[PDB]
Amino acid sequence: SSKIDFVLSVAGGFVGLGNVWRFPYLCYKNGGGAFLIPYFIFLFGSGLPVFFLEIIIGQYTSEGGITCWEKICPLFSGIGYASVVIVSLLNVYYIVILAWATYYLFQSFQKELPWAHCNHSWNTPHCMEDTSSTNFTSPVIEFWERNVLSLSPGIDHPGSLKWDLALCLLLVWLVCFFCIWKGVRSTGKVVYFTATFPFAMLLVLLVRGLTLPGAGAGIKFYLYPDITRLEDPQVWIDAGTQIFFSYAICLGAMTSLGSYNKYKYNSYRDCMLLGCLNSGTSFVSGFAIFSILGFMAQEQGVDIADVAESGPGLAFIAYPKAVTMMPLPTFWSILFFIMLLLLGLDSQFVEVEGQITSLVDLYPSFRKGYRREIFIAFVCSISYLLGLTMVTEGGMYVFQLFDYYAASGVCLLWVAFFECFVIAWIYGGDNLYDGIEDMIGYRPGPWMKYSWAVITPVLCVGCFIFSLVKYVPLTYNKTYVYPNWAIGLGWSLALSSMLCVPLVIVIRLCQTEGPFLVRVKYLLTPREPNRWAVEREGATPYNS
Ligand SMILES: [Cl-]
């Protein structure tokens, strides 16, 4: 009950599901240390500024993800809607990951781990024990492929959903619905098991990562950046996506959190601490993952680049292999699975609660008694239906598609650039300065102004231009080539969320009555000073 423990408990859970799952696979795909530089560049130039901006928006507007924009600038309020849609797409695969962990939980209660040996039913005759095996013939990899997912030849015929994954996803969705319906009262102490538990586990891995034989090669590879991959543009796209995924920005959840936060909240310290802790956690996770990969390369003899899958699910391949080497593998495996499940459940709770809060703030009584609860189910079950498409036999391809196009890609970058352009240019930097000064009692420095006005919008524009101009066909584990129609489907899924901005703009422009300048300025000016509209904003707000 000390001051330090209190100020630590005040700060929410810095650990995230993307830090333990998405960041390792992204770092392994991007080459290791070559990915660290763009990640740090985006965290310093764009991550923390956008995080602070969204926290300030939430704390000042005291509204959801959409109503805040209506209060700030109705013309671009459609942006908020798009964000909500993205959230849904996120869940479409996010909760699915939890089901996987759930299955591993039921596999963690045996004396002998299933991924330890090859002498099993689901393992193919090509399975070779570590005591060598190829990328697709390792015991843990064979287990993860042909016992949890049960991959298909391709996305042309996904087949029927697996009953095990279906039951796991159903149970997890029931837990998620009951946590909101009955309510969770153990939050005040849940940090004691959600905040301290992951980091310590990483320590148990880190001390083990340096202890694993043959891990020096993976560590030396991780500490060697490659300039040829830096010249390539996909690393920058992956870094910009991972920054937004880790900081949870561009999803409107941080806006709802700031709205729920008190008015006299010093957001600068929170933003700085969260950024530093996320950077440190990502560095430690990458170090441990590459140590594990070096150990696996030494044990199997294959090249470090060809050790495991260069795609989603790298955690379920890397962590059990390291736990098997640890003494008493059952205990550490159960601890890691419980920690991962709790982190993912907390992230899903936050995202779903933010989305429901935004949709209930936009449409009234769509939050009156039972009306607030039933709608929740109307979301969850529907998502569960989409979750079915991900729990199919060849559902990993649809999972990769939704991860690359639906909830990531050009969509998040476009939405973030538009938010920054509306706040800095349309709304005004001086207005935001005065708002922050009235809120927290201090005026931010010129660095935040230059980042919100020039650095972040131009950086996002360049990133999205590099993404659109130079595009590579999506592949799965560098072995399966997605069909031509799959690329079009992914682009259509991305454009469905991207086009939400101009459509609402045109709708509001046609909705407002009056001259053209009046029609535009009634949507540009906030709803609060809606007495008479200055048809031409002077050069003073724009240049300054
Ligand atoms: Cl990250």
CATH number for position 247: 1.20.1740
Three-class DSSP category at 91? helix
104 Cβ contact list (under 8 Å, min separation 6):
148, 316, 320, 333, 337
Separation of 191 CA from ligand 1 center, angstroms? 21
- Which phi and psi angles does 161 have, rounded to 5°? -70, 150
H/E segment holding residue 481: strand 480-481
DSSP 161: B
Rounded Cα distance between 284 and 203, Å, is 9
Find the farthest-apart pair of alpha carbons in the chain and give their distance in angstroms, rounded: 79
- Among 460, 488, 275, smallest CA distance to 401 is for 488
Q: Within 10 Å of residue 436's Cβ, how many Cβ atoms?
A: 21
Separation of 130 CA from ligand 1 center, angstroms? 31
Rounded Cα distance between 418 and 461, Å, is 10
Residues forming beta bridges with residue 392, ordered by sequence position: 161
Rounded Cα distance between 424 and 457, Å, is 9
Separation of 316 CA from ligand 1 center, angstroms? 18
Q: Which two tokens stand for residue 497?
A: 């969320």
Token look-up 């310590």 returns 200
Separation of 323 CA from ligand 1 center, angstroms? 23
Residue 15 near residue 276, CB atoms below 8 Å: no
- Which phi and psi angles does 271 have, rounded to 5°? -60, -45
Separation of 344 CA from ligand 1 center, angstroms? 15
| Dihedral sign from CA coordinates of 94, 313, 403, 96 | negative
Rounded Cα distance between 497 and 82, Å, is 5
210 Cβ contact list (under 8 Å, min separation 6):
219, 291
Q: Within 10 Å of residue 14's Cβ, how many Cβ atoms?
A: 19
Separation of 268 CA from ligand 1 center, angstroms? 20
Separation of 278 CA from ligand 1 center, angstroms? 6
Separation of 282 CA from ligand 1 center, angstroms? 5
H/E segment holding residue 259: helix 253-260
Separation of 151 CA from ligand 1 center, angstroms? 28
Separation of 513 CA from ligand 1 center, angstroms? 47
CA–CA distance from 8 to each of 2, 257, 485, 505 (Å)?
Answer: 10, 17, 49, 43
Technique used by the depositors: cryo-EM
Rounded Cα distance between 233 and 463, Å, is 8
CA–CA distance from 162 to each of 155, 332, 416 (Å)?
Answer: 15, 28, 37
Rounded Cα distance between 130 and 142, Å, is 12
Query: Is residue 334 assigned to a domain?
Result: yes
Rounded Cα distance between 260 and 253, Å, is 11
Query: Is residue 141 assigned to a domain?
Result: yes
Token look-up 């869940």 returns 91
Residue 318 near residue 308, CB atoms below 8 Å: yes
- Which phi and psi angles does 531 have, rounded to 5°? -95, -60
- Among 116, 108, 290, 319, smallest CA distance to 198 is for 319
274 Cβ contact list (under 8 Å, min separation 6):
11, 14, 51, 247
Residue 76 near residue 422, CB atoms below 8 Å: yes
Please, which contacts does 29-33 make with residues 24 or more away whose CB atoms are closer than 8 Å?
A: 29/238, 29/310, 29/311, 30/229, 30/234, 30/235, 30/238, 30/239, 31/225, 31/226, 31/229, 31/235, 32/221, 32/222, 32/223, 32/224, 32/225, 32/286, 32/290, 33/222, 33/223, 33/224, 33/225, 33/226
H/E segment holding residue 543: helix 539-543
Angle at 53 (CA atoms; ends 52, 56), nearest 5 degrees: 85
* Number of domains within the chain: 1
Residue 54 near residue 452, CB atoms below 8 Å: no
Is residue 502 left, alpha or beta, with left meaning phi > 0 and alpha meaning psi from -120 to 50? alpha
Resolution in angstroms, to 1 decimal, for this deposition?
Answer: 3.2
Query: Is residue 537 assigned to a domain?
Result: no
Residue 494 near residue 409, CB atoms below 8 Å: yes
Separation of 343 CA from ligand 1 center, angstroms? 14
Q: Which two tokens stand for residue 164?
A: 């095990």
- Among 344, 278, 300, 312, smallest CA distance to 145 is for 312
E strands, 102-169, are: none
Cβ burial of 50 (10 Å; 0-12, 13-18, 19+) is buried
Three-class DSSP category at 474? coil
Token look-up 């790298």 returns 314
Separation of 77 CA from ligand 1 center, angstroms? 29
Residue 325 near residue 208, CB atoms below 8 Å: yes
Rg, the chain, Cα only: 24
Amino acid at 281: T
Separation of 183 CA from ligand 1 center, angstroms? 30
Query: Is residue 495 assigned to a domain?
Result: yes
Separation of 226 CA from ligand 1 center, angstroms? 20
Separation of 391 CA from ligand 1 center, angstroms? 26
Residue 440 near residue 269, CB atoms below 8 Å: no
Separation of 458 CA from ligand 1 center, angstroms? 22
363 Cβ contact list (under 8 Å, min separation 6):
none
Token look-up 């901005």 returns 501
Rounded Cα distance between 501 and 81, Å, is 8
DSSP 75: G
SS (H, E, C) 294-323: HHHHHHHCCCHHHCCCCCCCHHHHHHHHHH
What is the C-alpha end-to-end distance of the chain, expressed in Å? 47
Separation of 283 CA from ligand 1 center, angstroms? 9
H/E segment holding residue 476: strand 475-476
Rounded Cα distance between 131 and 544, Å, is 67
Q: Which two tokens stand for residue 118?
A: 């090859």
Query: Is residue 207 assigned to a domain?
Result: yes
Three-class DSSP category at 392? strand
Helix, strand, coil percent content, the chain, rounded in steps of 5: 70, 0, 25
Separation of 71 CA from ligand 1 center, angstroms? 32
Separation of 94 CA from ligand 1 center, angstroms? 16
Three-class DSSP category at 365? coil
Q: Which two tokens stand for residue 392?
A: 């199919």
Three-class DSSP category at 19? helix
DSSP 122: S
Query: Is residue 521 assigned to a domain?
Result: no
Per-position b or e across 195-223, b if 16+ CB within 10 A of its CB:
bebbeebbebbeebbeebeebebbbebbe
Residue 93 near residue 407, CB atoms below 8 Å: yes
Token look-up 């939890």 returns 98
Rounded Cα distance between 492 and 296, Å, is 39
Query: Is residue 518 assigned to a domain?
Result: no
Q: Within 10 Å of residue 361's Cβ, how many Cβ atoms?
A: 19
Query: Is residue 254 assigned to a domain?
Result: yes
Residue 363 near residue 193, CB atoms below 8 Å: no
Instruction: Return the half-sphere exposure (C-beta side, CA atoms, 13 A cut-off) of residue 483.
Output: 9
Domain span including residue 178: 3-511
Separation of 317 CA from ligand 1 center, angstroms? 19
Cβ burial of 397 (10 Å; 0-12, 13-18, 19+) is buried
Residue 314 near residue 289, CB atoms below 8 Å: yes
Separation of 182 CA from ligand 1 center, angstroms? 33
